[PDB]
Amino acid sequence: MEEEEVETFAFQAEIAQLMSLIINTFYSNKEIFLRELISNSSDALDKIRYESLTDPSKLDSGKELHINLIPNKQDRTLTIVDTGIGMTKADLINNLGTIAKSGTKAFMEALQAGADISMIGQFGVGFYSAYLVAEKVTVITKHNDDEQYAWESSAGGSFTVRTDTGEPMGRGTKVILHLKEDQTEYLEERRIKEIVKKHSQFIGYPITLFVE
């Protein structure tokens, strides 16, 4: 038998309000969610490249810096996998819910004035777009300093962080989107290629689509 430690955290007040706003209001442009995830994946990769200045040991990695997309129609999930820096426990808690973001209220205000959900990234809260198409989000992450963790929230006010004892993934972050029944278009290969070409064409790393 294996064992994992679980922690439940409250979402910062305005993050929780934002998550409600997304989950219960219709928008679409929803496809911008993929660009946000690829962008964050791209930053984690930039950090790996710069960390080398403070830790030359990083250069010794055989791992290729890239982004993989994996649609699974049998399970109704879309997974975005990167080989970036990863996130320690503190990084997950601080950056995925617990700390205030100075752009949160302003964004909820812009949205109420009909601004496009596509502005989410420039307000400092782009990750919560994942909730435009997913009823539950699992974030598997592995950083050099620390253990592998899984973050998870079906929304509802909180999120748990636990030490992941599942399949090791090596350095990086894996975002697993459990799609709402009506968002199945994001499992199709033609739909997937359309939004990448459309929103993530200038990304500096290889992006790969795995089909079937």
Ligand X SMILES: CC(C)(C)c1cc(C(=O)N2CCOCC2)ccc1O
Q: How far is the CB of 137 from ligand X (least distance, A)?
A: 8
Q: Is 9 annotated as a binding residue?
A: no
Q: Which residue is nearest to ligand X (CB)?
A: 40
Query: Per CB under 6 A, which of residues 18..77 are in contact with ligand X?
Result: 37, 40-41, 43-44, 47
SS3 track for 25-83 = CCCCCCCHHHHHHHHHHHHHHHHHHHHCCCCHHHHHCCCCCCEEEEEECCCCEEEEEEC
Q: Is 40 annotated as a binding residue?
A: yes
83: contact with ligand X by CB under 6 A: no
State which residue, 71 or 86, has the beta carbon closest to ligand X: 86
Q: Is 82 annotated as a binding residue?
A: yes
Site for ligand X (CB under 6 A): which residue of 18, 32, 87, 179? 87
The angle subtended at Cα 107 by Cα 192 and Cα 111, nearest 5°, is 70
Query: Per CB under 6 A, which of residues 153..172 are in contact with ligand X?
Result: none
# of chain residues touching ligand X (CB under 6 A):
19
84: contact with ligand X by CB under 6 A: yes
Q: How far is the CB of 113 from ligand X (least distance, A)?
A: 25
127: contact with ligand X by CB under 6 A: yes
Which window, 11-19, 85-93, 114-122, 160-168, contacts ligand X (CB under 6 A)? 85-93
List residues binding ligand X (CB under 6 A). 37, 40-41, 43-44, 47, 82, 84-87, 91, 95-96, 127, 139, 141, 173, 175
**Which residues belong to the annotated binding site for ATP?**
40, 82, 101, 127
